[PDB]
Protein backbone atom coordinates (compact mmCIF):
# COMPACT_ATOMS: atom_id res chain seq x y z
CA UNK A 1 0.00 0.00 0.00
CA UNK A 2 1.37 3.39 -1.12
CA UNK A 3 0.32 6.99 -0.44
CA UNK A 4 -0.02 7.90 -4.15
CA UNK A 5 -1.37 5.85 -7.00
CA UNK A 6 -0.27 6.15 -10.63
CA UNK A 7 3.36 5.11 -10.17
CA UNK A 8 5.26 1.86 -10.60
CA UNK A 9 7.09 0.49 -7.52
CA UNK A 10 10.19 -1.64 -7.85
CA UNK A 11 9.56 -5.42 -7.80
CA UNK A 12 10.04 -6.82 -4.31
CA UNK A 13 13.17 -8.77 -5.29
CA UNK A 14 14.91 -5.50 -6.31
CA UNK A 15 13.72 -3.58 -3.23
CA UNK A 16 15.21 -6.33 -1.04
CA UNK A 17 18.57 -6.20 -2.83
CA UNK A 18 18.75 -2.39 -2.61
CA UNK A 19 17.94 -2.37 1.11
CA UNK A 20 20.36 -5.23 1.80
CA UNK A 21 23.04 -3.31 -0.13
CA UNK A 22 22.62 -0.22 2.08
CA UNK A 23 21.37 1.91 -0.83
CA UNK A 24 17.85 2.30 0.60
CA UNK A 25 18.37 3.28 4.23
CA UNK A 26 14.71 3.75 5.16
CA UNK A 27 14.86 7.44 6.03
CA UNK A 28 12.55 10.22 4.81
CA UNK A 29 14.26 12.78 2.60
CA UNK A 30 13.72 15.62 5.09
CA UNK A 31 15.71 13.70 7.70
CA UNK A 32 18.96 14.74 5.98
CA UNK A 33 18.31 18.27 7.32
CA UNK A 34 17.03 17.04 10.72
CA UNK A 35 20.14 14.87 11.36
CA UNK A 36 22.65 17.51 10.20
CA UNK A 37 20.99 20.25 12.27
CA UNK A 38 21.17 17.91 15.26
CA UNK A 39 24.89 17.24 14.77
CA UNK A 40 25.97 20.72 13.56
CA UNK A 41 23.25 23.19 14.62
CA UNK A 42 25.44 26.30 14.42
CA UNK A 43 27.15 25.66 11.08
CA UNK A 44 26.11 27.96 8.24
CA UNK A 45 23.78 25.96 6.01
CA UNK A 46 22.57 28.54 3.52
CA UNK A 47 23.65 31.91 2.10
CA UNK A 48 21.54 33.90 -0.34
CA UNK A 49 22.69 36.25 -3.09
CA UNK A 50 22.25 39.33 -0.85
CA UNK A 51 24.57 37.90 1.81
CA UNK A 52 21.98 36.78 4.36
CA UNK A 53 22.92 33.61 6.17
CA UNK A 54 21.20 30.78 8.05
CA UNK A 55 22.52 28.08 10.36
CA UNK A 56 21.37 24.45 10.23
CA UNK A 57 19.35 24.94 13.43
CA UNK A 58 17.70 28.06 11.97
CA UNK A 59 16.82 26.31 8.69
CA UNK A 60 15.48 23.20 10.49
CA UNK A 61 13.27 25.29 12.80
CA UNK A 62 11.86 27.45 10.01
CA UNK A 63 11.03 24.29 8.01
CA UNK A 64 9.07 23.03 11.04
CA UNK A 65 7.21 26.33 11.46
CA UNK A 66 6.26 26.49 7.78
CA UNK A 67 5.23 22.81 7.78
CA UNK A 68 2.87 23.60 10.67
CA UNK A 69 1.62 26.59 8.68
CA UNK A 70 0.97 24.45 5.59
CA UNK A 71 -1.06 22.05 7.74
CA UNK A 72 -3.22 24.92 9.01
CA UNK A 73 -4.08 25.57 5.33
CA UNK A 74 -4.96 21.91 4.69
CA UNK A 75 -1.81 21.14 2.66
CA UNK A 76 -0.29 17.86 3.76
CA UNK A 77 -0.48 14.05 3.84
CA UNK A 78 0.00 13.18 0.16
CA UNK A 79 -1.18 16.43 -1.45
CA UNK A 80 0.72 17.42 -4.58
CA UNK A 81 2.01 21.00 -4.62
CA UNK A 82 3.42 22.70 -7.73
CA UNK A 83 6.52 24.73 -6.79
CA UNK A 84 7.87 27.43 -9.13
CA UNK A 85 10.48 29.51 -7.30
CA UNK A 86 13.77 31.31 -7.97
CA UNK A 87 17.13 30.61 -6.31
CA UNK A 88 16.23 32.18 -2.97
CA UNK A 89 16.05 30.90 0.59
CA UNK A 90 12.25 30.66 0.29
CA UNK A 91 12.64 27.58 -1.94
CA UNK A 92 14.95 25.76 0.47
CA UNK A 93 12.73 26.36 3.53
CA UNK A 94 9.53 25.45 1.70
CA UNK A 95 11.01 22.28 0.13
CA UNK A 96 11.63 20.81 3.57
CA UNK A 97 8.39 22.22 4.99
CA UNK A 98 6.35 20.48 2.26
CA UNK A 99 8.18 17.19 2.91
CA UNK A 100 7.59 17.42 6.65
CA UNK A 101 3.93 18.29 6.08
CA UNK A 102 3.66 15.11 3.98
CA UNK A 103 3.03 17.04 0.77
CA UNK A 104 4.64 15.89 -2.47
CA UNK A 105 6.54 18.76 -4.18
CA UNK A 106 5.99 18.96 -7.95
CA UNK A 107 9.10 20.89 -9.05
CA UNK A 108 8.87 23.24 -12.04
CA UNK A 109 11.25 25.83 -13.44
CA UNK A 110 10.82 29.62 -13.29
CA UNK A 111 10.79 29.66 -17.13
CA UNK A 112 7.73 27.38 -17.36
CA UNK A 113 4.49 29.02 -18.46
CA UNK A 114 0.77 28.22 -18.64
CA UNK A 115 0.88 25.15 -20.87
CA UNK A 116 3.50 23.36 -18.74
CA UNK A 117 2.06 24.50 -15.39
CA UNK A 118 -1.53 23.58 -16.26
CA UNK A 119 -0.46 20.18 -17.59
CA UNK A 120 1.61 19.20 -14.56
CA UNK A 121 -0.98 20.68 -12.17
CA UNK A 122 -3.85 18.71 -13.65
CA UNK A 123 -1.78 15.52 -14.16
CA UNK A 124 -0.73 15.63 -10.49
CA UNK A 125 -4.15 16.84 -9.29
CA UNK A 126 -2.23 19.52 -7.40
CA UNK A 127 -4.01 21.35 -4.60
CA UNK A 128 -1.59 24.25 -4.25
CA UNK A 129 0.78 26.29 -6.39
CA UNK A 130 3.76 28.28 -5.07
CA UNK A 131 5.05 31.21 -7.17
CA UNK A 132 7.08 34.40 -6.95
CA UNK A 133 5.24 37.65 -7.57
CA UNK A 134 7.36 39.13 -10.38
CA UNK A 135 10.45 37.30 -11.66
CA UNK A 136 12.53 38.45 -14.65
CA UNK A 137 9.78 40.81 -15.78
CA UNK A 138 7.02 38.17 -15.72
CA UNK A 139 4.12 38.35 -13.26
CA UNK A 140 3.53 34.76 -12.11
CA UNK A 141 0.33 35.78 -10.28
CA UNK A 142 -1.41 36.18 -13.63
CA UNK A 143 -0.18 32.66 -14.41
CA UNK A 144 -1.59 31.37 -11.11
CA UNK A 145 -4.94 32.95 -12.03
CA UNK A 146 -4.80 31.20 -15.40
CA UNK A 147 -3.76 27.93 -13.74
CA UNK A 148 -6.58 28.07 -11.18
CA UNK A 149 -9.06 28.77 -13.99
CA UNK A 150 -7.96 25.64 -15.88
CA UNK A 151 -7.30 23.39 -12.86
CA UNK A 152 -10.04 23.47 -10.20
CA UNK A 153 -8.10 21.28 -7.75
CA UNK A 154 -5.78 24.25 -6.98
CA UNK A 155 -7.17 25.64 -3.69
CA UNK A 156 -4.20 27.71 -2.49
CA UNK A 157 -1.66 29.96 -4.20
CA UNK A 158 1.34 30.84 -2.02
CA UNK A 159 3.33 33.86 -3.22
CA UNK A 160 6.97 34.71 -2.44
CA UNK A 161 6.40 38.45 -2.60
CA UNK A 162 3.33 40.65 -2.75
CA UNK A 163 0.59 38.01 -2.66
CA UNK A 164 -2.30 40.11 -4.13
CA UNK A 165 -5.55 38.16 -3.44
CA UNK A 166 -3.53 35.00 -2.68
CA UNK A 167 -1.49 33.86 0.36
CA UNK A 168 1.92 35.29 1.26
CA UNK A 169 4.47 32.46 1.59
CA UNK A 170 6.02 34.28 4.56
CA UNK A 171 2.62 34.12 6.35
CA UNK A 172 2.59 30.30 6.13
CA UNK A 173 3.99 29.97 9.64
CA UNK A 174 2.75 28.38 12.87
CA UNK A 175 4.10 26.90 16.07
CA UNK A 176 5.70 23.53 15.29
CA UNK A 177 3.45 20.52 15.82
CA UNK A 178 4.38 16.80 15.87
CA UNK A 179 4.00 15.49 12.32
CA UNK A 180 4.10 11.85 11.29
CA UNK A 181 6.87 10.69 9.06
CA UNK A 182 6.26 9.30 5.55
CA UNK A 183 7.06 5.77 4.47
CA UNK A 184 10.54 5.89 2.87
CA UNK A 185 9.30 3.68 0.03
CA UNK A 186 6.66 6.23 -0.96
CA UNK A 187 7.03 8.98 -3.54
CA UNK A 188 8.88 11.97 -2.06
CA UNK A 189 8.71 14.43 -4.96
CA UNK A 190 7.77 14.65 -8.64
CA UNK A 191 10.30 15.94 -11.19
CA UNK A 192 9.49 17.22 -14.67
CA UNK A 193 11.03 15.24 -17.53
CA UNK A 194 12.36 16.98 -20.63
CA UNK A 195 9.90 14.83 -22.54
CA UNK A 196 9.53 12.96 -25.82
CA UNK A 197 5.69 12.99 -26.19
CA UNK A 198 3.01 15.62 -26.63
CA UNK A 199 2.88 16.25 -22.87
CA UNK A 200 5.58 16.67 -20.19
CA UNK A 201 5.84 13.55 -18.04
CA UNK A 202 6.36 13.54 -14.27
CA UNK A 203 9.05 11.40 -12.65
CA UNK A 204 8.27 9.98 -9.18
CA UNK A 205 11.28 9.82 -6.87
CA UNK A 206 10.99 7.96 -3.59
CA UNK A 207 12.52 8.88 -0.24
CA UNK A 208 14.84 5.88 -0.35
CA UNK A 209 16.04 6.30 -3.91
CA UNK A 210 16.45 10.10 -3.80
CA UNK A 211 18.38 9.95 -0.51
CA UNK A 212 20.69 7.36 -2.10
CA UNK A 213 21.06 9.52 -5.22
CA UNK A 214 22.08 12.42 -2.94
CA UNK A 215 24.25 10.42 -0.53
CA UNK A 216 26.12 8.37 -3.15
CA UNK A 217 26.64 11.48 -5.30
CA UNK A 218 28.13 13.40 -2.34
CA UNK A 219 30.61 10.55 -1.73
CA UNK A 220 31.70 10.36 -5.38
CA UNK A 221 32.16 14.14 -5.58
CA UNK A 222 33.95 14.45 -2.22
CA UNK A 223 31.33 16.72 -0.64
CA UNK A 224 31.74 17.24 3.09
CA UNK A 225 31.50 20.01 5.67
CA UNK A 226 34.30 21.88 3.84
CA UNK A 227 32.19 22.10 0.67
CA UNK A 228 30.79 25.52 -0.27
CA UNK A 229 28.38 24.82 -3.14
CA UNK A 230 27.11 27.53 -5.50
CA UNK A 231 23.63 26.81 -6.91
CA UNK A 232 23.93 28.22 -10.45
CA UNK A 233 21.28 26.11 -12.17
CA UNK A 234 17.67 26.43 -10.89
CA UNK A 235 17.21 24.89 -7.43
CA UNK A 236 14.49 22.69 -9.02
CA UNK A 237 16.90 21.19 -11.60
CA UNK A 238 17.86 17.61 -10.55
CA UNK A 239 21.55 18.43 -11.21
CA UNK A 240 21.62 21.37 -8.75
CA UNK A 241 19.19 19.79 -6.27
CA UNK A 242 20.58 16.29 -5.84
CA UNK A 243 23.66 15.41 -7.95
CA UNK A 244 24.89 16.09 -5.25
CA UNK A 245 23.61 19.69 -5.48
CA UNK A 246 22.17 21.55 -2.54
CA UNK A 247 20.69 18.47 -0.83
CA UNK A 248 24.09 16.76 -0.90
CA UNK A 249 25.72 19.87 0.58
CA UNK A 250 23.16 20.03 3.39
CA UNK A 251 23.35 16.30 4.07
CA UNK A 252 27.12 16.44 4.75
CA UNK A 253 27.08 19.80 6.56
CA UNK A 254 28.58 22.16 3.96
CA UNK A 255 27.34 25.60 2.92
CA UNK A 256 24.83 26.24 0.10
CA UNK A 257 25.22 29.58 -1.71
CA UNK A 258 22.35 30.70 -3.94
CA UNK A 259 23.29 32.40 -7.25
CA UNK A 260 20.58 34.54 -8.86
CA UNK A 261 21.91 34.03 -12.41
CA UNK A 262 24.79 32.09 -13.99
CA UNK A 263 26.35 35.28 -15.36
CA UNK A 264 30.03 35.89 -14.48
CA UNK A 265 28.80 39.13 -12.89
CA UNK A 266 26.79 37.28 -10.23
CA UNK A 267 28.60 33.94 -10.05
CA UNK A 268 32.23 35.16 -9.91
CA UNK A 269 31.33 37.69 -7.22
CA UNK A 270 29.75 34.95 -5.10
CA UNK A 271 32.63 32.53 -5.69
CA UNK A 272 35.06 35.10 -4.35
CA UNK A 273 32.81 36.46 -1.58
CA UNK A 274 31.78 33.09 -0.12
CA UNK A 275 34.87 31.04 -1.12
CA UNK A 276 32.80 28.62 -3.21
CA UNK A 277 34.53 25.26 -3.67
CA UNK A 278 32.08 23.45 -5.98
CA UNK A 279 29.39 24.23 -8.54
CA UNK A 280 27.52 22.66 -11.49
CA UNK A 281 26.83 24.23 -14.92
CA UNK A 282 25.60 23.29 -18.39
CA UNK A 283 28.25 23.44 -21.19
CA UNK A 284 27.11 26.83 -22.62
CA UNK A 285 27.76 28.38 -19.20
CA UNK A 286 31.12 26.57 -18.90
CA UNK A 287 32.14 28.16 -22.21
CA UNK A 288 31.01 31.58 -20.96
CA UNK A 289 33.05 31.28 -17.73
CA UNK A 290 36.12 29.95 -19.56
CA UNK A 291 35.96 33.07 -21.77
CA UNK A 292 35.11 35.51 -18.99
CA UNK A 293 38.12 34.84 -16.74
CA UNK A 294 40.17 36.56 -19.44
CA UNK A 295 38.58 39.93 -18.56
CA UNK A 296 37.06 39.42 -15.07
CA UNK A 297 39.15 40.19 -11.99
CA UNK A 298 37.36 37.98 -9.45
CA UNK A 299 39.51 35.70 -7.31
CA UNK A 300 38.14 32.25 -8.16
CA UNK A 301 41.00 30.30 -6.52
CA UNK A 302 38.75 28.68 -3.88
CA UNK A 303 36.95 26.72 -6.62
CA UNK A 304 37.98 23.03 -6.52
CA UNK A 305 35.28 21.23 -8.55
CA UNK A 306 33.34 22.27 -11.65
CA UNK A 307 30.63 19.81 -12.67
CA UNK A 308 29.54 20.14 -16.32
CA UNK A 309 26.57 18.22 -17.67
CA UNK A 310 23.20 18.41 -19.34
CA UNK A 311 24.82 18.16 -22.75
CA UNK A 312 28.20 16.94 -23.93
CA UNK A 313 31.14 19.23 -23.15
CA UNK A 314 33.72 19.27 -25.94
CA UNK A 315 37.13 17.74 -25.31
CA UNK A 316 38.78 21.04 -26.26
CA UNK A 317 37.05 23.27 -23.65
CA UNK A 318 37.19 20.36 -21.18
CA UNK A 319 41.00 20.58 -21.32
CA UNK A 320 40.85 24.34 -20.63
CA UNK A 321 39.08 23.99 -17.26
CA UNK A 322 42.23 23.43 -15.18
CA UNK A 323 44.44 26.16 -16.78
CA UNK A 324 41.64 28.72 -17.04
CA UNK A 325 39.52 28.09 -13.93
CA UNK A 326 42.05 26.43 -11.60
CA UNK A 327 39.82 23.51 -10.62
CA UNK A 328 38.99 19.89 -11.39
CA UNK A 329 36.48 19.18 -14.15
CA UNK A 330 33.84 16.52 -13.53
CA UNK A 331 31.75 15.48 -16.51
CA UNK A 332 28.22 14.45 -15.50
CA UNK A 333 25.87 12.57 -17.82
CA UNK A 334 22.65 12.22 -15.87
CA UNK A 335 18.89 12.43 -16.09
CA UNK A 336 15.95 13.27 -13.82
CA UNK A 337 14.69 9.72 -14.52
CA UNK A 338 17.61 8.26 -12.53
CA UNK A 339 20.98 7.00 -13.86
CA UNK A 340 23.95 9.28 -13.10
CA UNK A 341 27.35 8.90 -14.73
CA UNK A 342 30.29 10.76 -13.20
CA UNK A 343 33.92 11.02 -14.04
CA UNK A 344 35.76 10.39 -10.79
CA UNK A 345 37.73 13.26 -9.29
CA UNK A 346 41.06 11.40 -9.54
CA UNK A 347 40.42 9.87 -12.98
CA UNK A 348 43.33 10.46 -15.38
CA UNK A 349 42.81 13.71 -17.25
CA UNK A 350 42.32 11.72 -20.47
CA UNK A 351 39.05 10.28 -19.16
CA UNK A 352 37.85 13.60 -17.70
CA UNK A 353 38.44 15.25 -21.08
CA UNK A 354 37.07 12.48 -23.33
CA UNK A 355 34.29 10.67 -21.42
CA UNK A 356 31.00 11.46 -19.73
CA UNK A 357 31.64 9.27 -16.71
CA UNK A 358 30.72 5.85 -15.44
CA UNK A 359 27.57 4.95 -13.47
CA UNK A 360 27.15 6.08 -9.88
CA UNK A 361 25.99 2.79 -8.33
CA UNK A 362 27.53 -0.71 -8.47
CA UNK A 363 23.96 -1.86 -9.21
CA UNK A 364 23.32 0.57 -12.05
CA UNK A 365 22.72 -1.87 -14.90
CA UNK A 366 23.34 -0.72 -18.46
CA UNK A 367 22.60 -2.25 -21.87
CA UNK A 368 23.58 -0.74 -25.21
CA UNK A 369 21.36 -2.05 -27.99
CA UNK A 370 21.09 -1.77 -31.75
CA UNK A 371 17.94 -0.79 -33.65
CA UNK A 372 16.53 -4.30 -33.10
CA UNK A 373 16.98 -4.24 -29.31
CA UNK A 374 19.97 -6.63 -29.43
CA UNK A 375 23.09 -5.90 -27.39
CA UNK A 376 25.83 -4.29 -29.44
CA UNK A 377 29.39 -5.58 -29.62
CA UNK A 378 31.99 -4.02 -27.26
CA UNK A 379 32.65 -0.41 -28.19
CA UNK A 380 29.86 -0.15 -30.77
CA UNK A 381 27.36 2.71 -30.54
CA UNK A 382 23.74 2.04 -29.60
CA UNK A 383 20.88 3.18 -27.43
CA UNK A 384 21.45 3.17 -23.67
CA UNK A 385 18.95 1.21 -21.57
CA UNK A 386 19.32 1.31 -17.80
CA UNK A 387 17.92 -0.15 -14.57
CA UNK A 388 19.04 0.59 -11.02
CA UNK A 389 18.36 1.57 -7.40
CA UNK A 390 17.33 5.16 -8.28
CA UNK A 391 16.02 4.80 -11.88
CA UNK A 392 12.24 4.87 -12.23
CA UNK A 393 10.19 1.87 -13.36
CA UNK A 394 7.54 4.18 -14.84
CA UNK A 395 6.44 7.78 -15.16
CA UNK A 396 3.61 9.11 -13.00
CA UNK A 397 0.10 8.52 -14.41
CA UNK A 398 1.43 7.69 -17.89
CA UNK A 399 0.51 4.05 -18.59
CA UNK A 400 0.67 4.26 -22.38
CA UNK A 401 4.07 5.94 -22.49
CA UNK A 402 5.37 3.53 -19.83
CA UNK A 403 4.46 0.62 -22.12
CA UNK A 404 6.62 2.18 -24.87
CA UNK A 405 9.56 3.43 -22.80
CA UNK A 406 10.39 0.56 -20.41
CA UNK A 407 11.29 -2.96 -21.47
CA UNK A 408 9.28 -5.89 -20.14
CA UNK A 409 11.97 -6.57 -17.49
CA UNK A 410 12.16 -2.97 -16.30
CA UNK A 411 14.88 -1.28 -18.37
CA UNK A 412 14.32 2.41 -19.04
CA UNK A 413 15.03 3.40 -22.67
CA UNK A 414 17.02 6.63 -22.32
CA UNK A 415 17.00 7.59 -26.01
CA UNK A 416 20.73 8.40 -25.73
CA UNK A 417 23.26 6.91 -28.11
CA UNK A 418 26.47 5.93 -26.28
CA UNK A 419 29.41 3.59 -26.39
CA UNK A 420 30.96 1.93 -23.35
CA UNK A 421 34.75 1.91 -22.99
CA UNK A 422 36.77 -0.98 -21.49
CA UNK A 423 37.04 0.98 -18.20
CA UNK A 424 33.23 1.26 -18.00
CA UNK A 425 33.26 4.96 -18.88
CA UNK A 426 30.64 6.14 -21.37
CA UNK A 427 31.03 8.41 -24.38
CA UNK A 428 27.80 10.10 -25.45
CA UNK A 429 27.52 9.86 -29.23
CA UNK A 430 24.11 11.29 -30.08
CA UNK A 431 20.42 10.82 -29.56
CA UNK A 432 17.69 8.52 -30.82
CA UNK A 433 14.78 10.28 -29.06
CA UNK A 434 12.77 13.04 -30.78
CA UNK A 435 13.85 15.75 -28.36
CA UNK A 436 16.10 18.74 -29.03
CA UNK A 437 18.84 19.51 -26.50
CA UNK A 438 19.19 23.30 -26.66
CA UNK A 439 22.05 24.25 -24.35
CA UNK A 440 20.95 21.68 -21.75
CA UNK A 441 17.25 22.62 -22.13
CA UNK A 442 15.27 19.65 -23.45
CA UNK A 443 12.58 20.33 -26.06
CA UNK A 444 10.07 17.59 -26.83
CA UNK A 445 9.53 17.93 -30.59
CA UNK A 446 5.99 16.52 -30.54
CA UNK A 447 4.92 18.88 -27.73
CA UNK A 448 6.32 21.89 -29.60
CA UNK A 449 4.88 20.65 -32.92
CA UNK A 450 1.36 20.41 -31.46
CA UNK A 451 1.53 24.00 -30.14
CA UNK A 452 2.75 25.28 -33.51
CA UNK A 453 -0.02 23.42 -35.37
CA UNK A 454 -2.60 25.29 -33.28
CA UNK A 455 -1.56 28.41 -35.23
CA UNK A 456 -4.27 29.23 -37.84
CA UNK A 457 -1.70 29.53 -40.63
CA UNK A 458 -0.04 26.15 -39.94
CA UNK A 459 -1.29 22.79 -41.16
CA UNK A 460 1.65 20.58 -40.19
CA UNK A 461 4.82 21.21 -38.21
CA UNK A 462 8.06 19.24 -37.85
CA UNK A 463 10.60 20.42 -35.27
CA UNK A 464 14.20 19.56 -36.21
CA UNK A 465 17.47 20.08 -34.33
CA UNK A 466 20.27 22.01 -36.06
CA UNK A 467 23.86 21.75 -34.77
CA UNK A 468 25.27 24.76 -32.93
CA UNK A 469 28.87 25.23 -31.84
CA UNK A 470 28.12 26.82 -28.45
CA UNK A 471 24.51 25.82 -27.82
CA UNK A 472 24.73 22.23 -29.05
CA UNK A 473 21.43 22.35 -30.93
CA UNK A 474 19.02 25.05 -32.02
CA UNK A 475 15.37 24.57 -32.97
CA UNK A 476 14.09 24.77 -36.56
CA UNK A 477 10.31 24.79 -37.03
CA UNK A 478 9.46 23.29 -40.44
CA UNK A 479 5.91 24.31 -41.41
CA UNK A 480 3.36 23.23 -44.00
CA UNK A 481 1.00 26.22 -44.43
CA UNK A 482 -2.70 25.94 -43.78
CA UNK A 483 -4.50 25.50 -47.11
CA UNK A 484 -4.85 28.87 -48.81
CA UNK A 485 -3.17 30.64 -45.87
CA UNK A 486 0.28 32.01 -45.14
CA UNK A 487 2.43 30.37 -42.50
CA UNK A 488 3.89 32.74 -39.87
CA UNK A 489 7.50 33.90 -39.75
CA UNK A 490 9.75 33.43 -36.69
CA UNK A 491 8.74 36.56 -34.76
CA UNK A 492 4.96 36.08 -35.11
CA UNK A 493 5.22 32.39 -34.18
CA UNK A 494 7.30 33.25 -31.11
CA UNK A 495 4.62 35.73 -29.98
CA UNK A 496 1.84 33.19 -30.63
CA UNK A 497 3.62 30.47 -28.61
CA UNK A 498 4.45 32.87 -25.76
CA UNK A 499 0.77 33.93 -25.50
CA UNK A 500 -0.18 30.24 -25.58
CA UNK A 501 1.98 29.66 -22.48
CA UNK A 502 5.04 27.91 -23.97
CA UNK A 503 8.35 28.30 -22.10
CA UNK A 504 10.73 30.64 -23.92
CA UNK A 505 13.52 28.07 -24.37
CA UNK A 506 11.10 26.09 -26.60
CA UNK A 507 10.58 28.96 -29.09
CA UNK A 508 11.97 28.01 -32.54
CA UNK A 509 15.22 29.71 -33.49
CA UNK A 510 14.30 29.43 -37.16
CA UNK A 511 11.26 28.82 -39.37
CA UNK A 512 11.30 27.04 -42.74
CA UNK A 513 8.15 26.83 -44.86
CA UNK A 514 7.68 23.96 -47.30
CA UNK A 515 4.83 22.31 -49.19
CA UNK A 516 5.33 18.83 -47.67
CA UNK A 517 7.64 16.91 -45.37
CA UNK A 518 9.83 14.04 -46.54
CA UNK A 519 8.55 10.74 -45.18
CA UNK A 520 9.93 7.26 -44.62
CA UNK A 521 8.38 4.06 -45.98
CA UNK A 522 6.20 3.63 -42.88
CA UNK A 523 5.05 7.19 -43.61
CA UNK A 524 6.64 8.93 -40.61
CA UNK A 525 8.24 12.34 -41.12
CA UNK A 526 11.92 11.80 -41.99
CA UNK A 527 13.70 14.35 -39.81
CA UNK A 528 17.12 13.14 -40.97
CA UNK A 529 16.11 14.26 -44.46
CA UNK A 530 14.48 17.44 -43.12
CA UNK A 531 17.85 18.35 -41.64
CA UNK A 532 19.37 17.88 -45.10
CA UNK A 533 16.76 20.12 -46.72
CA UNK A 534 17.25 22.77 -44.02
CA UNK A 535 21.00 22.80 -44.79
CA UNK A 536 20.40 23.19 -48.54
CA UNK A 537 21.53 19.68 -49.50
N1 LIG B 1 26.95 15.35 -19.67
C2 LIG B 1 26.00 15.04 -20.72
N3 LIG B 1 26.43 14.82 -21.96
C4 LIG B 1 25.57 14.55 -22.94
N5 LIG B 1 24.26 14.49 -22.71
C6 LIG B 1 23.74 14.69 -21.46
C7 LIG B 1 24.60 14.98 -20.43
N8 LIG B 1 23.87 15.14 -19.30
C9 LIG B 1 22.58 14.97 -19.62
N10 LIG B 1 22.47 14.69 -20.95
C11 LIG B 1 21.27 14.39 -21.75
O12 LIG B 1 20.27 14.93 -20.60
C13 LIG B 1 19.65 13.90 -20.07
C14 LIG B 1 18.17 14.21 -19.80
O15 LIG B 1 18.21 15.52 -19.28
P16 LIG B 1 17.60 15.96 -17.80
O17 LIG B 1 16.50 15.00 -17.39
O18 LIG B 1 17.07 17.37 -17.95
O19 LIG B 1 18.76 16.01 -16.61
C20 LIG B 1 20.08 16.44 -16.85
O21 LIG B 1 20.36 16.99 -17.87
C22 LIG B 1 21.15 16.18 -15.79
C23 LIG B 1 22.49 16.42 -16.07
C24 LIG B 1 23.45 16.17 -15.12
C25 LIG B 1 23.07 15.67 -13.88
C26 LIG B 1 21.74 15.41 -13.60
C27 LIG B 1 20.79 15.67 -14.56
O28 LIG B 1 19.44 15.42 -14.28
C29 LIG B 1 19.99 12.64 -20.97
O30 LIG B 1 18.89 11.87 -21.35
C31 LIG B 1 20.74 13.21 -22.16
O32 LIG B 1 19.87 13.31 -23.27
MG1 LIG C 1 41.04 26.55 -7.58
Ligand nearest to C-alpha 200: 1
Q: Say if residue 50 carries a ligand binding annotation.
A: no
Obtained via which technique?
X-ray
- Strand 328-335 to 338-342 pairing: antiparallel
For the domain made up of 434-537, give the CATH fold. Answer: GMP Synthetase; Chain A, domain 3 (3.30.300)
β strands within 267-387, DSSP E: 278-281, 305-309, 328-335, 338-342, 358-359, 365-369, 382-387
Distances (CA, A) of 227 to 17, 134, 231: 32, 32, 12
Geometric angle at alpha carbon 275, from 272 and 280, rounded to 5°: 90
Residue 530: helix, strand or coil by DSSP? helix
The size of the chain, in residues, is: 537
Intra-chain end-to-end CA distance of the chain, in Å: 57
CA–CA separation, 429 vs 259, rounded Å?
Answer: 32
C-alpha torsion angle, residues 169, 175, 181, 187 (rounded to 10): -10
Q: Is 205 in the pocket of ligand 1 (CB under 6 A)?
A: no
81, 288, 439, 466 from 491: Cα distances, Å: 35, 27, 21, 19
| Cβ burial 338-375 (10 Å sphere, 16+ → b, else e) | bbbbbbeeebeeebbbbbbbbbbbeebbbbbbeeeeee
Q: Are 66 and 94 in contact (CB under 8 A)?
A: yes
Q: Who contacts 391 (Cβ-Cβ below 8 Å, separation ≥6)?
A: 337, 338, 339, 364, 412
Ligand nearest to the Cα of 278, by number:
2
- The finding on whether 310 has its CB within 6 A of some atom of ligand 1 is yes
Residues with CB under 5 A from ligand 2 (ion): 301, 303, 326-327
Task: Give the distance (Å) from ligand 2 centre to CA of residue 388.
Answer: 34
Which architecture characterizes domain 1-433 according to CATH? Answer: 3-Layer(aba) Sandwich (3.40)
Pick from 310, 439, 465, 471 the residue to mutate for probing ligand 1's pocket: most ligand atoms within 8 Å of its CB.
310
Q: How far apart are CA 52 and CA 58, in angstroms?
A: 12
Atom number in ligand 1 closest to CA 191: 17
- Give yes or no for a contact between 133 and 160, defined as CB atoms under 8 angstroms apart: yes
Contact 513, 479 (CB under 8 A): yes
293 is in an annotated binding site: no
What is the three-class DSSP state of 224?
A: coil
As a dihedral over the C-alpha atoms of residue 392, residue 396, residue 401, residue 405, rounded to 10 degrees, the angle is 0
Q: How far is the CA of 292 from the centre of ligand 2 (A)?
A: 16
Residue owning the nearest CA to atom 5 of ligand 1: 311
Rounded Cα distance between 378 and 366, Å, is 13
Instruction: Check pocket membership of 214 for ligand 1, CB cut-off 6 A.
Output: no
Name the nearest CA neighbour of 419 among 387, 386, 378, 391: 378
Query: Which resolution in angstroms does this entry have?
Result: 1.7
Q: Among 173, 159, 4, 144, which residue's Cα sits nearest to residue 80?
A: 4
The domain limits of the chain are 1-433, 434-537
Amino acid sequence: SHMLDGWVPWPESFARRYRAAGYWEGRPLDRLLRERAAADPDRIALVDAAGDRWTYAELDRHADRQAAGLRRLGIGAGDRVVVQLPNTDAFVVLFFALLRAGAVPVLTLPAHRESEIVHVAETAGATAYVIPDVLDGFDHRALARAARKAVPSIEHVLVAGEAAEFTALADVDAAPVPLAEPDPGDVALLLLSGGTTGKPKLIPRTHDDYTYNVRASAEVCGFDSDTVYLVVLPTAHNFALACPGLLGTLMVGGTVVLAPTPSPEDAFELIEREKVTATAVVPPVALLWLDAVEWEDADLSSLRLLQVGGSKLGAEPAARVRPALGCTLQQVFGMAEGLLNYTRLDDPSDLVIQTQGRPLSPDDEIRVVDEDGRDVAPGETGELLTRGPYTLRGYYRAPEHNARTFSDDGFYRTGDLVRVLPSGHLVVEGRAKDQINRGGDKISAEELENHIMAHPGVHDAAVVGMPDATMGERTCACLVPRAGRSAPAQRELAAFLTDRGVAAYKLPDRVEVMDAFPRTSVGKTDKKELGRRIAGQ
